[PDB]
Ligand binder design. Structure first.
Ligand SMILES: [Zn+2]
Lengths: 112, 10, 585, 588, 585
C-alpha cells in the first residue's frame, strides 16, 4: 500500500460497467489532501450512479487497508484495498485514482 | 500559496 | 626707764644680754645670754645635755616702762641652745620657728584658708594661740604643699591671698586684726603694672590694672608723683597663684599694688620706749610731723649694762597689706601619678589623679586638664574636635605643672611601665591603637610577615588590608550589609558568589544578564519559573531538550513551523485527538 | 689735688662725702651725703617731702685734676633719698639704667635685630639718656622673649649674650664697641680651663653647629703664664649647650669666641688704686709699680671723696685688648610651660610650625614666631620620605600648652593641645568614647559601651559610614550615593542565606562563562516579559518532568523539528490539528 | 708648741701668715702670705709673670707638735696667686679645687660608682693619690653629668649615695676609711620623716621610714627627746636620687636620717694641738666628758708672731654618713635628642636616644620610657592598651626629665624638623597617620577638592570615602573577600555586577530570583542547563521560540495540549514514524 483513499475516489465494480466515485459519510472528522474525508473500513453500504446498472447475472468488507492508523474504530483505506458487495462477489470493487489530487504551490513551481 | 499535498506511506 | 623680766619655764632668768626681733612678715627671734654666777654650779657641773632639756620650753619676756606703765609681752619657745666656755645662749624665737622645720608633700582639695590653716596647725605639735580669721573665706579648688615646711607653706599661701599672717607676741594672728633717731626714705617705684590670668574652666581672661592707694603719706605722694612720668608703659605679669574669678584677680592685683606702693616711702626709727609694739600705729614727730606709720618690724635690745634700746621700721599707716617677707613661691617639676577617676562634674574631659606621695595613705587631687596631640573645635564639630582619649583609672600618667606652680597641674601624657607595656614587635613592627573593649586599629610593617593594616574588635568583625598579598578581607561573624544608591562590583578576573543556604535576588524593576561566553546552569532540584508576560527565546544554534520523564505543554494556540522537515517519532501510539477536525494535509 | 663738684638739678651741692662706682657690666651707683648748714633751714624744716621731690633729678659729678687738667664727668639720676638725723640727706642713685631696672614685664620681639630691639626698649621708658646704639651683630634675630625681666635686665642679658659691649660711659649709654701714679697695684692670676666647646642643633636648617675654644686676643705676661700653667690641668674637652639660640654657624662661632675671651680675660687681672681722676672707664692704662706691669682696660672704678675732701680712686682691669667685656649683672631667665592660642599655621618654610599668641598678648594683641608642634609619632622612612607618623597640625584658635626647650624663653614649642571649656563636651558616661575627629566631621570612633552602641565607626559628615557592631557582631557599609568594589577577584562568601536587592535594576555583565550551581530548588518570578538570546546551541537536560503552561498562543520556529517520545505522543487540540506541508506527510 | 713648715715645689717658703681650712664635706683651702726680704730682689724685680709659674705647683704644710711629737701633713696645689704692693699671696688648696673648674655634659650607662669615679679622675690632668673604695658596688643604670664640673658631679653623686668623699690631707678618700674654748650646741629637728620612690621598670613602690641612731651623744639624745613631741605628723619626701631597689631606698633613707640626726647636737672647739686632724675622733674634756665628736671641719691659723691656733667643728662620733654641704643637685630642663634604638631587653617600649652633646664624639643614653597620649591596660586587653607608636631610630625627640633630675629622662615627644617633614597642606587640610611601610590613614578636609577619608597601603589597597560625592570606593589590586553568615547587598537604584572572566554562583540550597519587570538575557555562546528534578514553567503571555538550526525534543511521554488549534507546518516532509501506530480521535 502507498496512498490513502479519500472522498470522490474513482472506483469500478467487477460487473457494473461504469467508473463510479466513492462517497464517504461515516467520517466527518479526518480530512486529508486539503478537505477530503478519508475512507475507512466503516465506509460500508451504499457508499458510492452506483456503477450504472448491475451485471452480476447477464459493501461489507474493505480488506487491504492500513493497519497502523485507527480513525475511531476503523482503519483508513488504501489504493490496493478491495471491497465486496452483497449483491455481487468478494473483492469486486477496486480503485484506480484515490481522489488525492496534488495541487502545486510556490515550492513546486520552482523545481520545474 | 502552498496548495495541497498528498498523505501517503513512506 | 625700762625693766625687762625674762622667765624660762616660769623661772626668773638671770640674763647678761638680750636681743629680740619681731616682724609682721618673718619669724620673731630672740637671743638671751644667761649668766652663771661663780657661787652657783657651773654649766659643766650641770652638763650641757641637762641644760639642753630646755629645748622647746616656754620663754616669757616682759618689758615694762616705769614712767608710763606700758608693757610689751612676748611668749616664745627655745629652739637652739649653745653652751659656750661658761655661759648659755638661748636662741628660741617665736613658736612659728618650730613650724618651719618639716618639708613635706601635701594637698588640699576644695578647702578655704581657715580649714587649711587649722589642718596645718593641728597636724603640728607646737601649741600656740591662733586667731584664725582670714578675710578670703571662699574655698580654693586645689592647693599643693610642695617640698615646703608647715610655716613656709602657710606663709606663702596666706601672703598670696593678701592675708595678714604674723605672731603678735602672744598669738598667731591670721588675717587683719619720743624718738632718739629717725630716717625717712623715698624710692622711685613703678605703679604702672597689671596682672593677667586665664581661667580655662570658666573660659575667661582676667585682667587687673594697678589699683589706688590708701595708706599714703607726704613722702609716698611725692615719690609717686616723681616716679609717674618715668614708667609710661605698663608691665604685664601673670599671677603667682591661680585665680578662679575676676574678683579673685582684683584682690591679687590690689594686694600687689599696695605692697608695691607701701615701699615708696618708709621709716626707720630708734627709741627707748616700750609702747611701740609690732603691728601698731605711731605718729612720727621731730623732737614737724613725719606721718603715721604701722610698725612692721621692731628690735628690743638689752646690753650688759642693762640699758634698753629700741630700733624699728614702719610702713605708711593705712597700708592694707604687710610686706611679702618670708613668703616664697615654690617651683614644681613633672611628677608621676595614677588616674583615680575621670567623671568630671563640669564635663570638660578632666581627670582626677593621685600622686606618689599620697599612695601609702591614700588621697586624691583636684580635676586637671589632660593634654592632647590634637584638640579644639570647628564650625562643623564645635566640641571634642581632635584626639579625645581620656585616661582611665589606674593609668600611670606624667603630671606637668603650668608655669612652675604646684597648684597648676595638668596631665602631660600616659606611661607604659612594667604592667602597662608588653613591648614593641620584631624591629618595632606593630603600631596599634586599642581601647579597653578590644577595638584595634593596627599597622603591621613587617614586610616579610603579616604586613598590612587591620581594623578589628574582640568579637570577630575584621577589616584586613593584606599588603603582601594585595588582598582585602572583610569578615563579619553574623551579618554584613552593603547599603548604597548604586552598587558596582567590578572584578578584573573573577566574581565568585557563594551562599551556604540561599541566594535571593530581589530585583526592583529590570534584570539584564549579558554573558560573553557559555552559560552553564546545574540545578540540584526542581526548577520553577513564572513569567507574567510574553517569553521570547532566540537561538542561533541547535535547541535540544532531553527529558527523562513525561513532557507536558499547554497553550491556547500552538504552531510549530519547521523551515525543513518535521518528524514525530514514538515507541507507542501517536494521538491526534481534536474536536472540530484533524487535517493531515 | 682733685676737686670734685656735684650739681643737683643744676645747683651746686654742698656735700661732705661722695662715693661713685662705675662699671662696664653693672649700674653706676653714687651715694652723696649732703650738708645742711645750721643757718639755713634744716631738713625737718624743709620736710621729708619737698626734699623727696628731687627723685629723678639729674646729678652731675665733675672731677678735675689741677696738675694735669684732665676731667672726669658723670651724669646720673637720683633713685633713693634718705633724710635722717643735726640731720642730713643721703642722695643715692647712679646711671639712668638704674631706673630701667624696675619694671619686670613679659614681651617679645619677632624678626627684629638688636638695634631695633634696643631702640624700642628705650622708647618705652620714661628715662632720658643719650644713647649710642651701635651693636655689632646686625642680623635679624628670629625671636627674642622678655620673661618677667626689667627693661635693663632684658637688654643686659640680650646684649651680653651676643657679646655686645653694653655700658654707661658716664655721659651716654653705649651699645657696641666704642673703639677707644699708682698706689695699691695688685696683679692676680688664676687657673682656668680653656679646653671647652659649645654646641647647638638648628632644626629649621637641620645643622649641628659646633665651636671649639678660640684664640686669645688680649693677653699680658701673667695671662700667658696662667694659660701655660692651666694647659696640662684640663686635657678633656668640656662640651656645653648654647645659652642663647644660634641660627647659623657664624652665630655659634661668635658666641663661642665671646665666651672664650671672657674666660681668658678672667685668666689674670689687675686691682689698682690711685688719686688720679684721669683714669676713666673703658680706657687703657699702662700700669707701673713705682716697671711695666701690662696694659689693662679698666672695667670698673670707684671714685670717692671723704669728709676731709681727700679724693681717692680704685679700679679693676682686664688684659687690654680683650674683645668682650665681663659678663655681669646679666642672668638668663628660666621659662616654664605657658598656655597660649594658635593664630596661624601657614608656615613659609613648610615644616609644620605654628604661630601662637601667649596669654600676655591677649589684650593688646600680638603673636610669636614659628614654633614646632610636638607629636606622639614623627619622622621619616625609606618608603615615607616626609611626614611619617602623627601629623595633626593645630588650627587657629586652638588652646595649646607651650613648653620651652631647655630653660630658654627664646626656645618655645607646642607640647600639646587642651580641652578647656569652649571645645570639650567631656567624656561620655563611663568614658566609652574614643574618637579622632577632624574639622570637617570625619570621625574615627570607638565606643566601648558593651551595653549600648558598642563597636567602631568610620564616618563623614555627608553620610558615608563604616560600622563595626561588636554587640551584634555585624558589619555595615553605607554610602548615600554610589558604592564601588574593585578587585581582580571578588569573593562574596555567605555561610547562610545571601540577599541581593536592587531598587531599580540588577545588571550583570559577564565577559566569559557564567556558572550557576544551585544545590536546591530554583524559583524565578518575572513580573513582565522575559527575553533570551543564544548565539550558539541551547541544551537542556531534565531528570524529572517538563511542564510548560502558556496562557496565550505558543509558537515554535526551527529549521528541522524532531519530536521523539520514548513512550507515547498525544497531540490534543480543541479547534483543529493541521499538518500542512509543502512536500507531503508520510506515515512510514 | 707647734712649728709649721711650708714647702712650695719642694723649696722652703718664708711666710708671715698661714691659713688652712679643711673639711670632710668641701674643699681644703689655704692662703699663705710669703715674705720677701729687703735684701733679696722684690716681687716686681721678678715680676708677676715669673711668680705666676707657681700656679699648679705642689704646696706641703707640715705642722708638728714639739711635746707630743704628733704631726699633721697637708699636700695641695696653688690655684690663685696675688702679687700685691710688695708681697705674694698663694691662695690654693687641695687638688680637689682644680676639679671644680670645668662644667660639662656627660653620661654613664650601667656603671658602678668605682668606674665612674675612676673615669672622672682619669679625664683630668690634676693628679693626686686616691682611695676609690665606695661601699655601693652595684651598677647604676644611668648617671648624668648636667652642666657640672668634675668635682661638683662627683660630690653630688657620692654624697647622694651616702659615701664618704673628702680629701684627707694627702689622699682623696672615697668611701668610709687640751682645749681652749668649747661650744656644744643643740637644736630641735624633726625625726618623723619618710622617703618614697616609685620604680616603674619593676613596678614597685619603695617606701622608707626614719631609721635608728648610731652615734648619739648625750646632748643629741636630749635634743631628740625634746624634739619628739613637736613633730607628730610624718613628713614625706621624694628621693632626689633614683632608687632601683628596696635596699637602695633603705640606704638612701638611712643616709638622710643620719645626716639629719647628726645635726641635733654638735660641737665646736679650739686648741693649739696638731694631733687633732680631720675625720678622726677626739674625746672632748672640759678644761666630765662631752662626747666622741668626729672632726668634720678644722682651721689651722698662723699669725705673724708665729702663734699656731686651731679651730674645729665636730659631729657626734659614730655617725655613719658625713655632712652634705658642697653636694648640690642639678635641675634639668627639656632637651632634644635622636632615637638610636628601640630594642628594650625588658620589653617595655623604652627607647635609647643620643643627646646633642654626645653627637660629635658619639655615645648613647640608657633606656627611657616614651610618653604616650593613651597608655594603660584593661580586662580584655591587659597589655599595650592605647596609643602604641614607638619611635624609630633616627627620629628627633624632645626628652623631658621627671622631677628636675637629669638621671630621670623620658621621651616627651617627637618633632618634625626640616629633614623630617613637609609642611601642612594648603589651609591645613590633611591629617594623617602613616607608618614606615607606607600605611596611611588620612583625613582630607578640603571640601573644594579631595574631601574625604582614605585608608590605604603602598601596594594599592584602598578604602576611600569620597565625601564630596558621597561615594565609597574599596579597591584591591588582587582578590577581595567578603565573609559573613548573612550578606546583604541593598541598592536603592541600579545595582551593577561585572567580571572580565567567568562569574561563578554557588548556592547551597534553593535559589530565589524575583524580578519586578523585564528580564533580558544575552548569551554569546552555548547555553547548557541541567535540572535534577522536574522543570515547571508558567507563561502568562505568549511563548515564542525561534531556532536557527534544528530543534530536538526528546522525552518519555510528550503531551501537547492546545485550548485552540494546533498547527504543524513544514517546508518538507512531515514524518510520522511510530512503532505502535497512530491514532486519530
Ligand atoms: Zn455491484
Amino acid at each position: 500500500g502507498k496512498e490513502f483513499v479519500v472522498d470522490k475516489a474513482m472506483c469500478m465494480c467487477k460487473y457494473g460497467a461504469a467508473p463510479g466515485k466513492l462517497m464517504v459519510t461515516d467520517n466527518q472528522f479526518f480530512r486529508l489532501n486539503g478537505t477530503k474525508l478519508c475512507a475507512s473500513t466503516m465506509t460500508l453500504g451504499n457508499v458510492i450512479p452506483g456503477f450504472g446498472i448491475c451485471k452480476v447475472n447477464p459493501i461489507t468488507q474493505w480488506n487491504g487497508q492500513f493497519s497502523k492508523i485507527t480513525m475511531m474504530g476503523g482503519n483508513p483505506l488504501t489504493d490496493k484495498s478491495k471491497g465486496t458487495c452483497s449483491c455481487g462477489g468478494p473483492d469486486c470493487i477496486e480503485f484506480m485514482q484515490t481522489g488525492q489530487i496534488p495541487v502545486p504551490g510556490s515550492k513546486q513551481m520552482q523545481q520545474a | 500559496v502552498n496548495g495541497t499535498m498528498k498523505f501517503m506511506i513512506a | 626707764a625700762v625693766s625687762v623680766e625674762i622667765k624660762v619655764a616660769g623661772k626668773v632668768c638671770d640674763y647678761v644680754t638680750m636681743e629680740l626681733f619681731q616682724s609682721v612678715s618673718t619669724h620673731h627671734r630672740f637671743k638671751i645670754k644667761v649668766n652663771y654666777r661663780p657661787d652657783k654650779p657651773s654649766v659643766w657641773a650641770i652638763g650641757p645635755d641637762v641644760i639642753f632639756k630646755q629645748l622647746g620650753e616656754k620663754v616669757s619676756i616682759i618689758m615694762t616702762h616705769h614712767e608710763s606703765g606700758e608693757k610689751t609681752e612676748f611668749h616664745g619657745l627655745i629652739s637652739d641652745i649653745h653652751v659656750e666656755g661658761g655661759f648659755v645662749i638661748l636662741e628660741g624665737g617665736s613658736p612659728t620657728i618650730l613650724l618651719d622645720r618639716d618639708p613635706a608633700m601635701d594637698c588640699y582639695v576644695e578647702q578655704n584658708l581657715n580649714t587649711i590653716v587649722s589642718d596645718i596647725l593641728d597636724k603640728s605639735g607646737v601649741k600656740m594661740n591662733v586667731t584664725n580669721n582670714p578675710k578670703h573665706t571662699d574655698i580654693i579648688p586645689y592647693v599643693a604643699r610642695y617640698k615646703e615646711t608647715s610655716y613656709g607653706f602657710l606663709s606663702r599661701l596666706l601672703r598670696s591671698y593678701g592675708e595678714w599672717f604674723y605672731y603678735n607676741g602672744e598669738t598667731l594672728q591670721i588675717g587683719n586684726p619720743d624718738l632718739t633717731g629717725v630716717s625717712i626714705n623715698a624710692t622711685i617705684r613703678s605703679l604702672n603694672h597689671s596682672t593677667y590670668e586665664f581661667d580655662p574652666v570658666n573660659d575667661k581672661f582676667y585682667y587687673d590694672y594697678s589699683g589706688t592707694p590708701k595708706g599714703a603719706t607726704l613722702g609716698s605722694r611725692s615719690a609717686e608723683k616723681c616716679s609717674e612720668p618715668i614708667f609710661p608703659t605698663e608691665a604685664k605679669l601673670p599671677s603667682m597663684r591661680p585665680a578662679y574669678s575676676a574678683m579673685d584677680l582684683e584682690h591679687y592685683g590690689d594686694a600687689g599694688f599696695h605692697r608695691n606702693y607701701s615701699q615708696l616711702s618708709q621709716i626707720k626709727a630708734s627709741s627707748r620706749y616700750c609702747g611701740i609694739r609690732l603691728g601698731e600705729l605711731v605718729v612720727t614727730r621731730v623732737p614737724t610731723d613725719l606721718g603715721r606709720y604701722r610698725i612692721t618690724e621692731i628690735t628690743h635690745t638689752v646690753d650688759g649694762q642693762g640699758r634698753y634700746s629700741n630700733t624699728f621700721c614702719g610702713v605708711p599707716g593705712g597700708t592694707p597689706v604687710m610686706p611679702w617677707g618670708d613668703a616664697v613661691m615654690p617651683v614644681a617639676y613633672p611628677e608621676m601619678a595614677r588616674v583615680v577617676s575621670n567623671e568630671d562634674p563640669k564635663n570638660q574631659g578632666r581627670v582626677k589623679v593621685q600622686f606618689m606621695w599620697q599612695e601609702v595613705d591614700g588621697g586624691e587631687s583636684y580635676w586637671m586638664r589632660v593634654q592632647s596631640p590634637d584638640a579644639g573645635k570647628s564650625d562643623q564639630v564645635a566640641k571634642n574636635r581632635g584626639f579625645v582619649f581620656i585616661p582611665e583609672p589606674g593609668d600611670l600618667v606624667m603630671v606637668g605643672f603650668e608655669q612652675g606652680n604646684p597648684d597648676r597641674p595638668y596631665v602631660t601624657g600616659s606611661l607604659f611601665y612594667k604592667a602597662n607595656s608588653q613591648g614593641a614587635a620584631t624591629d618595632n613592627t606593630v603600631k596599634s591603637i586599642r581601647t579597653r573593649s578590644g577595638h584595634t586599629l593596627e599597622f603591621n610593617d613587617d614586610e616579610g610577615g603579616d604586613w598590612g593594616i587591620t581594623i578589628k574588635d574582640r568579637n570577630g568583625c575584621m577589616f584586613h588590608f593584606d599588603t603582601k598579598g594585595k588582598n582585602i578581607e572583610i569578615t563579619a561573624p553574623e551579618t554584613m550589609t552593603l547599603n548604597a544608591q548604586n552598587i558596582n562590583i567590578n572584578a578584573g578576573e573573577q566574581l565568585n558568589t557563594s551562599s551556604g543556604k540561599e541566594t535571593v535576588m530581589q530585583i526592583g524593576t529590570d534584570f539584564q544578564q549579558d554573558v560573553g561566553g557559555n552559560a552553564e546552569i546545574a540545578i540540584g532540584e526542581s526548577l520553577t519559573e513564572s513569567i507574567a508576560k510574553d517569553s521570547t527565546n532566540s537561538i542561533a544554534g541547535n535547541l535540544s531538550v532531553t527529558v527523562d520523564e513525561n513532557l507536558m505543554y499547554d497553550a491556547q494556540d500552538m504552531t510549530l513551523t519547521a523551515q525543513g522537515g518535521m518528524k514525530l517519532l514514538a515507541n507507542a501510539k501517536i494521538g491526534l485527538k481534536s474536536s472540530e477536525g484533524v487535517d493531515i494535509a
